[PDB]
Write a protein that binds this ligand. Structure first.
Ligand code: K
Ligand code: K
Ligand code: K
Ligand code: K
Ligand code: K
Ligand code: K
Ligand code: K
Ligand code: K
Ligand code: K
Ligand code: K
Ligand code: K
Ligand code: K
Ligand code: K
Ligand code: K
Ligand code: K
Ligand code: K
Ligand code: K
Ligand code: K
Ligand code: K
Ligand code: K
Ligand code: K
Ligand code: MG
Ligand code: MG
Ligand code: MG
Ligand code: MG
Ligand code: MG
Ligand code: MG
Ligand code: MG
Ligand code: MG
Ligand code: MG
Ligand code: MG
Ligand code: MG
Ligand code: MG
Ligand code: MG
Ligand code: MG
Ligand code: MG
Ligand code: MG
Ligand code: MG
Ligand code: MG
Ligand code: MG
Ligand code: MG
Ligand code: MG
Ligand code: MG
Ligand code: MG
Ligand code: MG
Ligand code: MG
Ligand code: MG
Ligand code: MG
Ligand code: MG
Ligand code: MG
Ligand code: MG
Ligand code: MG
Ligand code: MG
Ligand code: MG
Ligand code: MG
Ligand code: MG
Ligand code: MG
Ligand code: MG
Ligand code: MG
Ligand code: MG
Ligand code: MG
Ligand code: MG
Ligand code: MG
Ligand code: MG
Ligand code: MG
Ligand code: MG
Ligand code: MG
Ligand code: MG
Ligand code: MG
Ligand code: MG
Ligand code: MG
Ligand code: MG
Ligand code: MG
Ligand code: MG
Ligand code: MG
Ligand code: MG
Ligand code: MG
Ligand code: MG
Ligand code: MG
Ligand code: MG
Ligand code: MG
Ligand code: MG
Ligand code: MG
Ligand code: MG
Lengths: 114, 209, 56, 118, 61, 123
RNA sequence: GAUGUCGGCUCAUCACAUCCUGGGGCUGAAGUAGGUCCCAAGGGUAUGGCUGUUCGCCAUUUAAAGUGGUACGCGAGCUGGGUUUAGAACGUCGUGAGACAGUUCGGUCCCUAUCUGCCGUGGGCGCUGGAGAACUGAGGGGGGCUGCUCCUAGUACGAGAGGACCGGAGUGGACGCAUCACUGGUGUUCGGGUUGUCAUGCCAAUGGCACUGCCCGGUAGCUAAAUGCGGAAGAGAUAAGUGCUGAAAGCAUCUAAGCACGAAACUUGCCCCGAGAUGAGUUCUCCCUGACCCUUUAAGGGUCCUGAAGGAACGUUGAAGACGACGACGUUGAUAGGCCGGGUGUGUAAGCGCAGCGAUGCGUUGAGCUAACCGGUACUAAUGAACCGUGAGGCUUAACCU
RNA sequence: AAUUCCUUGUCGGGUAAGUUCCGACCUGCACGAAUGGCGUAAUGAUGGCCAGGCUGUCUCCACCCGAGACUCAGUGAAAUU
RNA sequence: CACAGGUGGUCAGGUAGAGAAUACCAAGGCGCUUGAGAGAACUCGGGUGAAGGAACUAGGCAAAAUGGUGCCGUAACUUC
RNA sequence: AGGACCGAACCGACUAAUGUUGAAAAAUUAGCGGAUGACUUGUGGCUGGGGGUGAAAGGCCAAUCAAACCGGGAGAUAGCU
């Protein structure tokens, strides 16, 4: 209700950039090893977005060292330091789950040039 | 220590600065008014009766109205009792706020679990279903055997069978108190507590510790 | 499965002790036509709460 | 369990329910009062009233939408030419249900459902 | 129970006998007779014969 | 989420190409093994001149799963296949000398420091 | 005048002759690790290969993979591989029909629960005027498992190798309870793509049917693989065992008098049910303060008047529910529908314009549509009434006022 | 071995593990040459074993759509005793 | 039995299709002689399913899966 | 050309589930085999009970088959209940 909505508004981030499925994004996240805390960059195609307020999430898919990796980021998590859109993709679906069966040329996404 | 009566508002998350998401239940604990104090001389045991919330004046019956009026408090939506330790002492009409849990680390939350209705043995007691194929006849989710032969020639009491599941009093123990918000009358506890959204909860300091 | 012994008329009556019907507690009286009707239902003449709701 | 679920199955499959409510909405718009069973009337509210809310605003898109909901140009025309203007100021509740006893054939609870300005 | 037990009796009765020599691990088994006692006697004879055969094999080696 | 009969790829260069989980170690009635868990494997396919031969039984540590792992903030990392790294029965140290493909932070233990150091990328 | 069977499956329940975990004695017990016996039944006590198998062997685990009873538990619960009819064949026997604790291939498993029992859920009356609540707790049930790592400490012990007791912390397996914030499943009630065909006069745009035609996403709800929590600590009395003081028996002696320890067993502590606990309990509050007549004259029956507190009924309903029941609400109202705004999902509707020969693209346009969600809103339906329930509540004896 | 009791014979293959299967061996309880012997392409709703695909068969079940079961109105059996 | 059984011949429209298959239709004929609700267990008939993938079982039973046309190409063995 | 191939009608009946006081005294649903032949089907005919007929199962001969049904001998006989 209003109580929960208030508790979530006071936590939600304010600078989340606009991105859409098919966009290529780079997400800088905080990696804590021993005592040192640094940023690791995960770059790939956004294949799913879940708009749920504080509980918003998005899935990014990349091909790292010959293996397909999908990572689901909680948008307002403090561990997600930064999100930047490196390329705008032109798709017609909200969820690009068909990309899991495609590799190389077949997985190309046309650029949204406007 | 005594507890409080609250309402289950819902579930959320709290993001700590070190990147941890804590699942929390939000409990709206408004002021609890003491409507009666019981002692050894008159009642044989030491406890306080409290009420909370508000009720329709035309849905408060005259017996309830008189009981509230003797205490001099507004009619709440119910009455609950809390046993008193020998140190604790309250007075009729006193109001107790969520600040009582300011220094409490863990709590026990009791509520009426969500009702499932008439439930089968598979759902209610985690019985294993019989084979779905391989000739099985009409006996896919049935209990199976329910006893031995002529000895004892009966079914034992407490046999696990199908029946009403849920809609009963359930207590979850030793939940962390994530946050006590006095101004909003909020108790944020870590984890899930019994009952649906908008149900009554009884929150006590943890008895195990 | 079937009975080993014939049940009695006593047991039959005991079972049927809960089969009794309940008469309607009371009938409402329309404020305009004066006709008795089931509460929250229209009358036989097409009246409900004093208003002619269905003609004929 | 059916916790927080809406819609009556009415001992029918989905396509049958949809067709029956399309027909019943057409009949209710045509005659402005019909006699059906009480559960069917309570379900017919949730179908007919959005049609009138749609007909409140007259446009080609809305007319085609109303046709898709109720495949009858007579009902579409009556909606958009009479019922929209008739119920323009009314917020909701364009229908009322009056319980009217029990059906002789099967003791089914019956009710008239009619337009509130009839 | 013996294999291919045919009848209520045979299905129910424990007639087959197996004898295992713990030091050696050699096992003999008999289920030819309806009587457990006869099967045990025959299996004992076979076990004695197998132990003797093992010792004779060692000596011949 | 690896159980018995599950076929896994090999993330090292020990020579195996396909292995099969035959036991999830570490507890009675234990069902699944996630990333960072040790399983008993048999080698189903191997390269001709590898350090291991088809039909061998040894241990492995699961390093990639399709079910994925979950981080404290609720995030989940999923891979496209199930991959493990072979280990000796006794020492439980990696057999190969190279590790192929990314591994996760769940291996950050004094037990699997060799795998962490050799991994191309740690997530 | 019929008590169906081996094994498996589902579900068990008890014993103890204890497999693990708990306690102890002796040891040919240095430590680690064992042997053996005593106490202890609280919990726990594998997955696979082969075989119809029980058994067994084998692989790999585990703290452990206990031994038994229960019609060798359990077919009006399932199965039907073996067994066990009728077909057929091999070996073998018989001249033959046929036969084989020889083998081989094939071969109908019914029952709508009356009673007891059991799991749940109501109705009636009772509890001594009626009623609404909150309790107490006699009693009953649930729960009770354990690994590994680290510290103590490379300490005690040991020639070395190796390597503790006691105590403390962390993190797991299995199990159970709850919940849906996250990750997911489902989501024939939301959006879209698309094949065939038919129809809406036609175009365009839509609808029907083809398993939701096939699909791709997905709200609410339900849900696990998801994520919170639990087993305890403590106390009492003990088992085997260890003792103290101490005679009988000048010594000795744990015992006879007296005293102290002593375990997952017991009884509590934790959770749930619980006053039909007929021994029906307690507390708080509310309501009812009229007259008359008879009889067999009393816990008697009428007559009139009166009809309370409250309940029930009806209606709108509900994360409550098979029906009952339980909860919310009924105009002095947010109970449901609608409506409004938001959200969410889907993915840029139609119509028009432009480009293109055209399929189509672009713009308008993140457009359109959007269930169960959230916040509001009396527009619709929750009607005044009526119905049940009474009129101060027995006797005896105490104590107190009187 | 549709035949072998002993017997899950022994050895090889296949599997982490194989009383089944395949290849040998010969010690044929109790094969054997028209109640034919030994082969054999093709064929088989024929028996056994193995692999790939594929999956709720299973780990371990969850949700959904319908027909019943449940309630109301009408009619209205049965075995058994 | 107003019974999901059996019962010979003749006729043979459209679109897609090789087709008398199959889908939607025409002419024509029907909605199957109890309904109304609700939306428990359980049974029946379907749909979908994370990770795994025969670990199930006597046995891959059941289910899932494959599926058209044209072209390329196709092993042992063979009675060719 | 073919007791050729694929596949409807047609003829059958290999598997499973359902049903088992059934919709049905042998079926339904999903699959399955044959489908120019030793094929299938209509009408009529003939073979008769120790008889027929049987690509052989003691199968079939009117829901009856190691000797059909109906009537008679007949109140067979029953050391049995
Ligand atoms: K009727
Ligand atoms: K012990
Ligand atoms: K000992
Ligand atoms: K025990
Ligand atoms: K055996
Ligand atoms: K047992
Ligand atoms: K029985
Ligand atoms: K009885
Ligand atoms: K969820
Ligand atoms: K969901
Ligand atoms: K169409
Ligand atoms: K002494
Ligand atoms: K009472
Ligand atoms: K409303
Ligand atoms: K557009
Ligand atoms: K447009
Ligand atoms: K939108
Ligand atoms: K032979
Ligand atoms: K001959
Ligand atoms: K064959
Ligand atoms: K004859
Ligand atoms: Mg419920
Ligand atoms: Mg059956
Ligand atoms: Mg079934
Ligand atoms: Mg009755
Ligand atoms: Mg609702
Ligand atoms: Mg019905
Ligand atoms: Mg008898
Ligand atoms: Mg003992
Ligand atoms: Mg005991
Ligand atoms: Mg105890
Ligand atoms: Mg087998
Ligand atoms: Mg016995
Ligand atoms: Mg047994
Ligand atoms: Mg038995
Ligand atoms: Mg039985
Ligand atoms: Mg059999
Ligand atoms: Mg021969
Ligand atoms: Mg057969
Ligand atoms: Mg049965
Ligand atoms: Mg107990
Ligand atoms: Mg939610
Ligand atoms: Mg989803
Ligand atoms: Mg659609
Ligand atoms: Mg068109
Ligand atoms: Mg049509
Ligand atoms: Mg359809
Ligand atoms: Mg313990
Ligand atoms: Mg109930
Ligand atoms: Mg949106
Ligand atoms: Mg459209
Ligand atoms: Mg071998
Ligand atoms: Mg052989
Ligand atoms: Mg001869
Ligand atoms: Mg021959
Ligand atoms: Mg043939
Ligand atoms: Mg009836
Ligand atoms: Mg009929
Ligand atoms: Mg017919
Ligand atoms: Mg045609
Ligand atoms: Mg057809
Ligand atoms: Mg009918
Ligand atoms: Mg259903
Ligand atoms: Mg089903
Ligand atoms: Mg779907
Ligand atoms: Mg499916
Ligand atoms: Mg799956
Ligand atoms: Mg999958
Ligand atoms: Mg696979
Ligand atoms: Mg197997
Ligand atoms: Mg196998
Ligand atoms: Mg098995
Ligand atoms: Mg099959
Ligand atoms: Mg299929
Ligand atoms: Mg042919
Ligand atoms: Mg054919
Ligand atoms: Mg035939
Ligand atoms: Mg068929
Ligand atoms: Mg053929
Ligand atoms: Mg015919
Ligand atoms: Mg016949
Ligand atoms: Mg004769
Ligand atoms: Mg006679
Ligand atoms: Mg005579």
């Amino acid at each position: 209700s209003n109580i929960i909505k208030q508790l979530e508004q006071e936590q939600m981030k304010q600078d989340v950039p606009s991105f859409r499925p098919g966009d290529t994004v780079e997400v800088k996240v905080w990696v804590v090893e021993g005592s040192k805390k640094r940023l690791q960059a995960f770059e790939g195609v956004v294949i799913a977005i879940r708009n749920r307020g504080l509980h918003s999430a998005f899935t990014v898919r990349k091909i790292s060292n010959g293996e397909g990796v999908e990572r689901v980021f909680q948008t307002h998590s403090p561990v997600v330091d930064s999100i930047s859109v490196k390329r705008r993709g032109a798709v017609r679906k909200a969820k690009l789950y068909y990309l899991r069966e495609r590799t190389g040329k077949a997985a190309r996404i046309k650029e949204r040039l406007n | 220590m005594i507890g409080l009566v609250g309402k289950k508002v819902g579930m959320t998350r709290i993001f700590t600065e070190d990147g941890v998401s804590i699942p929390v239940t939000v409990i709206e604990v408004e002021a609890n008014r003491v409507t009666q104090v019981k002692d050894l001389a008159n009642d044989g045991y030491r406890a306080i009766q409290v009420t909370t919330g508000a009720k329709k004046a035309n849905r408060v019956t005259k017996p309830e109205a008189g009981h509230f009026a003797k205490a001099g408090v507004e009619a709440g939506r119910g009455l609950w009792e809390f046993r008193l330790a020998e140190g604790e002492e309250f007075t009729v009409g006193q109001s107790i706020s969520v600040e009582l849990f300011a220094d409490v680390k863990k709590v026990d939350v009791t509520g009426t679990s969500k009702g499932k209705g008439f439930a089968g043995t598979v759902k209610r007691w985690n019985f294993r279903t019989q084979d779905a194929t391989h000739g099985n006849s009409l006996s896919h989710r049935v209990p199976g055997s329910i006893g031995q032969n002529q000895t004892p020639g009966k079914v034992f009491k407490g046999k696990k069978m199908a029946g009403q599941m849920g809609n009963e009093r359930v207590t979850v123990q030793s939940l962390d108190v994530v946050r006590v918000d006095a101004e909003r009358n909020l108790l944020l506890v870590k984890g899930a507590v019994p009952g649906a959204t908008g149900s009554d909860l009884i929150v006590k300091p943890a008895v195990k510790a | 499965a079937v009975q080993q012994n014939k049940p009695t008329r006593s047991k039959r009556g005991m079972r049927r002790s809960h089969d009794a019907l309940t008469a309607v507690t009371s009938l409402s009286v329309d404020k305009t036509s004066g006709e008795k009707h089931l509460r929250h239902h229209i009358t036989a003449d097409g009246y409900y709460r004093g208003r002619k709701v269905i003609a004929k | 369990m059916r916790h927080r679920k809406s819609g009556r199955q009415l001992n029918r499959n989905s396509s049958h329910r949809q067709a029956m409510f399309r027909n019943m909405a057409g009949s209710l718009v045509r005659h402005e009062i019909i006699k059906t069973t009480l559960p069917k009337a309570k379900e017919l509210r949730r179908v007919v009233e959005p049609l009138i809310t749609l007909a409140k605003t007259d446009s080609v898109a809305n007319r085609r939408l109303a046709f898709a909901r109720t495949r009858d140009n007579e009902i579409v025309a009556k909606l958009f030419n009479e019922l929209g203007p008739r119920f323009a100021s009314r917020a909701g509740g364009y229908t009322r249900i009056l319980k009217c006893g029990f059906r002789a054939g099967d003791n089914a609870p019956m009710a008239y459902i009619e337009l509130v300005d009839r | 129970r013996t294999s291919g037990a045919g009848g209520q009796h045979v299905n129910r009765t424990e007639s087959a006998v197996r004898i295992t020599h713990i030091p050696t691990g050699i096992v003999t088994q008999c289920q030819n007779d309806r009587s457990q006692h006869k099967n045990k006697d025959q299996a004992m004879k076979q076990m004695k014969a197998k132990l003797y055969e093992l010792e004779m094999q060692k000596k011949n080696a | 989420m690896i159980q018995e009969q599950t076929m896994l790829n090999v993330a090292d260069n020990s020579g195996a190409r396909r292995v099969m989980c035959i036991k999830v170690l570490g507890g009675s009635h234990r069902r699944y093994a996630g990333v960072g868990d040790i399983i008993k494997i048999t080698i189903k396919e191997a390269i001709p001149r590898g350090k291991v031969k088809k039909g061998d039984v040894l241990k492995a540590v699961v390093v990639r799963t399709k079910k994925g792992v979950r981080r404290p903030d609720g995030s989940v990392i999923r891979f496209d296949g199930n991959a493990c790294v072979l280990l000796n029965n006794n020492s439980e140290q990696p057999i190969g000398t190279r590790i192929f493909g990314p591994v996760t932070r769940e291996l950050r233990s004094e037990k699997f420091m060799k795998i962490i150091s050799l991994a191309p990328e740690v997530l």
